From a paper:
The optimized crystals diffracted X-rays to ∼2.2 Å resolution and belonged to space group P31. The asymmetric unit of the Av3MDO crystals consists of 12 monomers arranged in pairs of C2 symmetric dimers. Analysis of residual electron density maps revealed two strong features near the Av3MDO iron center, which could not be successfully modeled with aquo ligands as was the case for Pa3MDO. A chloride ligand was bound to iron in the coordination site assigned as the O2-binding site. Chloride binds to the iron center trans to His90 at a distance of ∼2.4 Å and simultaneously contacts the hydroxyl moiety of Tyr159 forming a 2.7 Å ion–dipole interaction. The carboxylate group simultaneously engages in an ionic interaction with Arg168, which is situated adjacent to the iron center. In comparison to the homologous residues of Pa3MDO, residues Tyr61, Pro88, and Phe180 of Av3MDO are shifted inward toward each other to occlude the potential passageway. Notably, the difference in Trp81 rotameric state results in different arrangements of the “SHY” motif between Av3MDO and Pa3MDO. In combination with spectroscopic simulations and optimized DFT models, this work provides an experimentally verified model of the Av3MDO enzyme–substrate complex, effectively resolving a debate in the literature regarding the preferred substrate-binding denticity.
Thiol dioxygenases are a subset of nonheme iron oxygenases that catalyze the formation of sulfinic acids from sulfhydryl-containing substrates and dioxygen. Av3MDO exhibits the classic thiol dioxygenase cupin fold consisting of three N-terminal alpha-helices followed by a series of 11 β-strands forming the cupin β-barrel structure that houses the enzymatic active site. Like in Pa3MDO and other thiol dioxygenases, the iron center of Av3MDO is coordinated by three His residues (90, 92, and 142) contained within the conserved cupin motifs. The moderately hydrophobic dimer interface buries an average of ∼1260 Å2 (1199–1322 Å2 depending on the specific dimer pair) or ∼13% of the total monomer surface area and is structurally similar to the dimers observed for 3MDOs from other bacteria, all suggesting that it represents a physiologically relevant assembly.
Residue numbers in the entry:
A (entry chain A): 5 to 198
B (entry chain F): 6 to 113, 116 to 172, 177 to 198
């Protein structure tokens, strides 16, 4: 009985929102509200895009806009998995869905990477923002050693195809194109099935 | 697989409808963009090219965020046909693989308009309430499957339309999964 209508309605609303060509602050404010409404419910994500991998965290594209104005991704960390330290180069929202993860912000200093504040500790329903304007560099990791964690991320592009960077401790940058773990997206558009 | 072709078609079709042009302009520029896609048979994933023994298959490839358009791979097995149906929105039919025919109809009951249009790879046809909406599309080969790529001014699988002897018609989709056409680094 997957409530795929929730993801369909999120995608529609996010489309309508960007049709008004609003500023980043308005996108993040209205966006985090719409994402909050989606990730408050754990009755809609298909099992195929909730699956951990033993070697690396999984990046399942759920929807990309026709003009690549936004994308929606299911990120799945297994026990003890982390992202590299990375930037985005576009606005991003992180909606916590299942389990426990932490997000550490970083800044580029004289020495290299320095963490800003404590890790932000996410639990289901919580939404965080990233952007070049408000803070773009972070590392997201599973805070459980025996359970997988899932967050739904929304970006101001097709994030899997954005040329961005990972950072080493000394602040040196490697090119980063994340791509996607899935060859298949979920069909959220067969409304007659419901 | 040259999935970049489908990605570029979807982008261009989005840009086109951003200009909020009239149906005539959509069909004119659209059939040109679709013609460019279906002239090449190096991009369709095999999972959305598969015939079914019992009924023709309707694989959604892409739906717009606001359901302004959709792109569908239709697959007829040897000797399969659609019912006689309308669309209630503009539609483009791009022939990709094999041989099919399209018979137009008018309400008189049903009378066929002209001969069946005989499609071969690269050919693009249009339907719309304005220009003629009622047709039947069928495989013209008795041993080979046929594939055409269709583009509609809605999420066609969810449009309330009709089949004609009117019965209500909502076509839906054969696939639970769409292709990921957005992983550009794979190329
Ligand atoms: Cl992120
Ligand atoms: Cl059609
Ligand atoms: Fe991130
Ligand atoms: Fe048709
Ligand atoms: Mg918290």
């Amino acid at each position: 009985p997957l409530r795929l209508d929730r993801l369909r309605d999120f995608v529609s609303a996010l489309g309508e929102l960007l049709d008004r060509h609003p500023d980043e602050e308005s996108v993040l404010r209205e966006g985090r509200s719409l994402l909050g409404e989606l990730v408050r419910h754990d009755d809609w994500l298909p099992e195929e895009f909730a699956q951990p991998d033993p070697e690396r965290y999984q990046q399942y594209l759920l929807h990309a806009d026709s003009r690549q104005r936004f994308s929606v991704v299911s990120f799945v960390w297994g026990p003890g998995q982390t992202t590299p330290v990375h930037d985005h180069r576009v606005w991003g929202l992180i909606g916590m869905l299942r389990g426990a993860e932490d997000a550490q912000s970083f800044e580029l200093g004289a020495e290299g990477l320095r963490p800003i504040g404590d890790p932000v500790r996410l639990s289901p329903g919580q939404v965080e923002a990233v952007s070049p304007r408000i803070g773009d560099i972070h590392r997201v990791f599973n805070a459980s050693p025996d359970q997988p964690s899932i967050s739904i991320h929304v970006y101001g592009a097709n994030i899997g195809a954005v040329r961005r960077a990972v950072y080493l401790p000394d602040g040196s940058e490697k090119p980063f194109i994340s791509g996607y773990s899935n060859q298949f997206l979920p069909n959220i558009w067969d409304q007659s099935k419901e």
